[PDB]
Design a protein around this nucleic acid. Structure first.
Ligand SMILES: [Mg+2]
Ligand SMILES: [Mg+2]
Ligand SMILES: [Mg+2]
Ligand SMILES: [Mg+2]
Ligand SMILES: [Mg+2]
Ligand SMILES: [Mg+2]
Ligand SMILES: [Mg+2]
Ligand SMILES: [Mg+2]
Ligand SMILES: [Mg+2]
Ligand SMILES: [Mg+2]
Ligand SMILES: [Mg+2]
Ligand SMILES: [Mg+2]
Ligand SMILES: [Mg+2]
Ligand SMILES: [Mg+2]
Ligand SMILES: [Mg+2]
Ligand SMILES: [Mg+2]
Ligand SMILES: [Mg+2]
Ligand SMILES: [Mg+2]
Ligand SMILES: [Mg+2]
Ligand SMILES: [Mg+2]
Ligand SMILES: [Mg+2]
Ligand SMILES: [Mg+2]
Ligand SMILES: [Mg+2]
Lengths: 50, 51, 194, 50, 100, 121, 148, 182
RNA sequence: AAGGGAAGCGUUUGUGACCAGACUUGCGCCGUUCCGAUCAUCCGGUGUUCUCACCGGUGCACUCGGGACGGCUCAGGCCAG
RNA sequence: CGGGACCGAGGUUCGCGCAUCUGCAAGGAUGCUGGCGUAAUGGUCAUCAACGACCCGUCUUGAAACACGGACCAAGGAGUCAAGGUUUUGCGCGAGUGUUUGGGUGUAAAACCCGCACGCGUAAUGAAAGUGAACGUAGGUGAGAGCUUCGGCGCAUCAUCGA
RNA sequence: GUCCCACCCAUACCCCGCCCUCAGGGUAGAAACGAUGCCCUGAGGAGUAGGCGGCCGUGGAGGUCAGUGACGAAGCCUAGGG
């Protein structure tokens, strides 16, 4: 059941961003897509000379 | 676990970890269509996008 | 589980038991236990031949004694083993088993209308070819050809009757099968169509 | 999703333990309502309280 | 010598099997040994049963070893096929052929 | 004999010889670790000798197994070879030198009865 | 035992544990207490304060038998009584007897009042006694006998 | 390569006694089993103290046992060490003491008072979990060597002097009349 | 055996000489020829119910054991599809 | 859903799962087939070939050095012992401890036994004359492993105010 | 000079096998073990001066293997083997 909710939750969040963007275009205003909250870091430069 | 099996490639291992994987495939949740006539931008949105 | 069968032989007066074979002491006991392997989760599934291995197609033998020859596919048996015969009166290839990985499946198909599938069986059934190999392996010495079993001679003769008649109805198929396949200069197999 | 399913290992008693079934996640992150891989993935993608 | 319940199987003088076990309080008395000598003509299966009866009471963790050792002693006492003829390779074959 | 084992894989079948043991006759072939301050072998330069280390160690399951599958046990008596009565599947008799011709025959005779392998019959 | 030594462990390594630079020389720094005021001053000032100088007056023919006066703290007075006798006094068997110790027989001269005493009266014959040792004996009901 | 500051760091605590005492080996085997197969934190501490050396198991006197045993009477005093006798204790009450060792004077006096002088293997019999026990440690820093540790200026520690007198360390760095004070 | 202003050495093949192993069969079930097994008595030991001593076991497709010759299953060396 | 490559560790059942009255691809390879059964695989050595490879020890910031020692081989060749300290480890006894200067005895340079003194420790501090360690459950406060009759007691040790 | 695709390979990164070190668990009304053992899991591995641990070898002493040996000990030679 929790997987059901999450799959639906992911589905609905993406459409709201699209719907908000499209409705802003119709109105003529601008919608800020909100800053990202999660980032993934990758270290790619060794362990020497730091 | 002597040998890690990838759920992304082993279907049986995927099912022990996510029982909703089977329902996702049959219900075609990854291929949901959106219908209806799209609402295009007005002529004011353009001619503002280009100066 | 239990599998004891405690019989009772007579020996004059009705006594004595003589327990079942797999119930008595071993009469020899090892100093160390055997490895006793674990259970294996590998169940045999039938071999899936290629899409082009339709029975009646002409194949090119790439190895073995009859390499380069062209034969007709009769039936795919199992585990990659094919039953083929390039008619013995055409190119001299008897009824023979060939592994499906050492052939080329061409686009030429010979109609098998006239060949009984009943006789295709009982020769696709195994042990047919190597029935008397161990019995006949004399090599103690003017060499002479190992005479072919009269049963197999008759079997090949029966199949060839229908097969050759159908083959001869094509203008060049009879000569095409009688020839052998070779690579000339400029023939690139990766580019050659079959 | 693909990072956690394929290269996702847990930290159990200062040991790197492969996440092959939900028991490891249940017995470690159970106090926070995360009992399965989908719960773990949802808590990462959507920045949750835990 | 260490354990207070010990089992010992040794070959018999005249081709039998001898089983020796420790009695109670043997830590103070060395000669407190209960020894039984099965004959050479006794059935192999019966000898295993007789030893299995005794070892089970004391230890039952030496059931395999006591029975197997009796089997090993019995195996060594039977007749022996001498050997198979040893083939020679390379120079040894050439040397033998040239010599003979 | 040689009941059962994993294949005997040897990580290195050659051995390690001492640095410059081939150029100088006073320097033995037995390995000694180069302790010089400028030595190229000790510094692991490319194209030089390798030094022994763990990592070249043999598998524990097959560490001291001869290619047949047995482990060698040195035997010098008929009473010594009887110790392997219960281990004839994992140990092989090896009659040491100094054993006279007569005593060698008895050890072969007895080890044949025990079905114990003798590596120098 | 020589087989338990670093010497058997340094066989093969050049410097034998003493270093390539700054090698093991003969006497780099002096022989003995050399330079106690000049270059070994940082060791003496740190670990041996009071080493240099002169304190007090002299005593030309000091005989240490004059200064002989072993002490006995009253917390161990009753240990000089034998085990069988000490039982009845300590246990509380009040009676008409009182022990006499005569410390000098046990090799003691002065008596000092460190510990405590049971209220049993006791007689002690001592060469010297302290103020508190006498006070704690009197309170227990004892008697001090000064002897020579 | 991985950026670590330490590699293959070992545990700093002893994991098995260095003693070749065969009887002590049996005692450790018993308390290895007990500490593993019980939830008693008392068993773990007793196992750990059996490993310790002789300077980490200082002797205890009956007087120090008596001092701590109030009002903890009806409890078994457990000392992983040696229990010594005190002359300054004129009477010994009835006590239950379990210890690795007892001096002959201490064992006789405890038993004469009507108490129990038992060993740690006896203790594990009636008290497999330290149900009513008083775990007591002797004075660790009462050793003579500890008086010398950390010597330095203004540390008030004991110097390494081979004699006591007006000489050998009393002049300079010990009084302001000769240079300075420490 | 090798050798166009050094040689030696490491990784890896090819070639030539030499050589150690492994393998030869073994365990099971059913078919021929000779000996003592189930059980009970009588001493003596013993973990108090197991066994050794003598003795009735009487035995050709019946027991027990052993060799002789045949059949079948399983396992078994090296290289591979 | 195809084409290819490398790998098959583990060794009675147990588990997580999927399917359904079968079982499975789900806690690590099985099945079928063929040649040979010996120098065929394999190993050692010699040699050729591809790629690579400066002469060791030493002092030095830096040695292949146009820095020094080294023609070659065998044998010999360098952190030892005593006294006195100290820290740590093991052991015996433990407010004591140490027989062996000496005596008795002996299977006779051994082993065994004996005791008075003495050494160190149990009391320190003063230059010395000298004096010489409990107000108190040998104290109060904070932390504290462990125990708990669940309210508390609290070893060692540390910090602090005292006697 | 700039831009774009494809490809080559370090002892680096990923997966797997094996060695060792370190760390964390299990194993007795013992059918039970060189418990100084065995089983399971994870991480790590350069090194002069230096420190520590375990092992190999030599000359002797006590105990033991009822040890080997003139039917051949010790030594020595051996592009023969493990
Ligand atoms: Mg693994
Ligand atoms: Mg070094
Ligand atoms: Mg030097
Ligand atoms: Mg220096
Ligand atoms: Mg300098
Ligand atoms: Mg690394
Ligand atoms: Mg020239
Ligand atoms: Mg070769
Ligand atoms: Mg693919
Ligand atoms: Mg070869
Ligand atoms: Mg070869
Ligand atoms: Mg070359
Ligand atoms: Mg080069
Ligand atoms: Mg040197
Ligand atoms: Mg310079
Ligand atoms: Mg130059
Ligand atoms: Mg110079
Ligand atoms: Mg010169
Ligand atoms: Mg004396
Ligand atoms: Mg004294
Ligand atoms: Mg205080
Ligand atoms: Mg561990
Ligand atoms: Mg000789």
């Amino acid at each position: 059941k929790r997987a059901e909710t999450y799959v639906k939750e992911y589905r609905d969040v993406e459409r709201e961003k699209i719907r908000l963007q499209r409705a802003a275009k119709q109105d003529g205003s601008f919608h800020i897509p909100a800053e990202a909250k999660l980032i993934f870091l990758i270290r790619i430069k060794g362990i020497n000379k730091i | 676990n002597v040998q890690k099996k990838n759920p992304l490639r082993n279907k049986q291992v995927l099912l022990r970890l996510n029982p909703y994987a089977a329902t996702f495939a049959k219900e075609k949740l990854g291929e949901i269509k959106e219908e209806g006539k799209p609402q295009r931008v007005p002529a004011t949105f353009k001619t503002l996008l280009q100066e | 589980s239990s599998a004891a069968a405690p019989q009772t032989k007579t020996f004059g007066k009705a006594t004595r038991t003589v327990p079942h074979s797999s119930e008595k002491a071993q009469k020899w006991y090892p100093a160390e236990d055997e490895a006793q392997p674990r259970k294996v989760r590998k169940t045999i599934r039938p071999w899936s031949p290629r899409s082009t291995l339709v029975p009646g197609t002409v194949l090119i033998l790439l190895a073995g004694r009859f390499r380069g020859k062209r034969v007709v596919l009769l039936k795919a048996l199992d585990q990659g083993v094919l039953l083929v015969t390039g008619p013995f009166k055409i190119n001299g290839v008897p009824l023979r088993r060939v592994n499906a990985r050492y052939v080329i499946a061409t686009s030429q198909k010979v109609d098998l209308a006239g060949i009984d599938e009943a006789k295709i069986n009982e020769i696709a059934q195994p042990k047919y070819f190597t029935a008397e190999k161990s019995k006949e392996k004399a090599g103690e010495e003017k060499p002479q050809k190992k005479e072919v079993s009269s049963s197999r001679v008759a079997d090949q003769k029966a199949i060839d009757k229908a097969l050759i008649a159908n083959i001869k109805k094509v203008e060049f198929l009879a000569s095409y099968l009688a020839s052998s396949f070779t690579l000339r200069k400029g023939d690139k197999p990766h580019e050659m169509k079959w | 999703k693909e990072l956690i399913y394929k290269r996702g290992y847990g930290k159990v008693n200062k040991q790197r333990v492969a996440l092959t079934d939900n028991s490891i996640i249940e017995e470690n992150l159970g106090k926070y309502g995360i009992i399965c891989m989908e719960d773990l993935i949802h808590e990462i993608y959507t920045v949750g309280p835990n | 010598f260490v354990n207070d319940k010990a089992v010992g199987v040794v070959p018999g003088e005249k081709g039998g099997v001898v089983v020796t076990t420790k009695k109670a309080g043997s830590i103070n008395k060395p000669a407190a040994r209960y020894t039984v000598a099965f004959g050479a003509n006794k059935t192999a299966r019966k000898t295993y049963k007789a030893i299995a009866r005794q070892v089970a009471g004391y230890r039952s963790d030496l059931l395999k070893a006591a029975v197997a050792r009796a089997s090993a002693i019995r195996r060594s006492q039977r007749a022996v096929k001498p050997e198979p003829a040893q083939k020679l390779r390379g120079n040894a074959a050439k040397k033998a052929a040239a010599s003979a | 004999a040689a009941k059962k084992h994993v294949p005997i894989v040897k990580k290195r079948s050659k051995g390690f010889m001492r640095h410059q043991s081939d150029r100088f006759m006073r320097v033995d072939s037995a390995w000694r670790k180069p302790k010089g301050i400028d030595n190229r072998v000790r510094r692991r330069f490319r194209g030089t000798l390798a030094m022994p280390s763990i990592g070249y160690g043999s598998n524990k399951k097959t560490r001291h197994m001869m290619p047949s599958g047995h482990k060698a046990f040195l035997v010098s008596n008929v009473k010594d070879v009887e110790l392997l009565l219960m281990h004839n599947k994992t140990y092989a008799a090896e009659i040491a030198h100094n054993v006279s011709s007569r005593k060698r025959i008895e050890i072969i005779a007895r080890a044949k009865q025990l079905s114990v392998k003798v590596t120098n019959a | 035992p020589t087989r338990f030594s670093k010497t058997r462990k340094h066989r093969g390594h050049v410097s034998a544990g003493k270093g390539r630079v700054g090698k093991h020389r003969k006497h780099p720094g002096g022989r003995g207490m050399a330079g106690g005021q000049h270059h070994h001053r940082t060791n003496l000032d740190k670990y041996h304060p009071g080493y240099f100088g002169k304190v007090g007056m002299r005593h030309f023919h000091l005989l240490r038998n004059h200064q002989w006066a072993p002490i006995l703290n009253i917390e161990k007075l009753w240990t000089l009584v034998p085990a069988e006798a000490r039982e009845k006094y300590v246990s509380g068997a009040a009676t008409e007897t009182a022990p006499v110790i005569d410390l000098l027989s046990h090799g003691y001269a002065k008596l000092l009042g460190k510990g405590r005493l049971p209220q049993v009266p006791i007689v002690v014959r001592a060469r010297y006694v302290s103020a508190e040792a006498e006070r704690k004996i009197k309170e227990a009901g004892g008697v001090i006998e000064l002897v020579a | 390569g991985i950026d670590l500051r330490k590699h293959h760091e070992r545990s700093t605590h002893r994991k098995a006694p260095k003693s070749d005492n065969v009887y002590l080996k049996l005692l450790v085997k018993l308390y290895r089993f007990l500490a593993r197969r019980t939830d008693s934190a008392f068993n773990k501490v007793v196992l750990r103290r059996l490993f310790m050396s002789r300077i980490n198991r200082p002797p205890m006197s009956i007087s120090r046992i008596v001092a701590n045993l109030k009002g903890n009477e009806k409890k078994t005093v457990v000392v992983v060490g040696t229990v010594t006798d005190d002359n300054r204790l004129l009477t010994v009450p009835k006590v239950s003491v379990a210890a690795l060792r007892f001096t002959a004077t201490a064992r006789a006096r405890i038993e004469a008072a009507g108490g129990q002088a038992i060993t740690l293997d006896q203790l594990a019999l009636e008290k497999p979990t330290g149900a009513n026990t008083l775990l007591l440690r002797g004075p660790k820093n009462a050793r003579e060597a500890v008086k010398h540790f950390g010597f330095g200026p203004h540390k008030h520690k004991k110097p390494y002097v081979a004699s006591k007198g007006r000489k050998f360390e009393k002049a300079r760095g010990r009084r302001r009349s000769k240079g300075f004070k420490v």
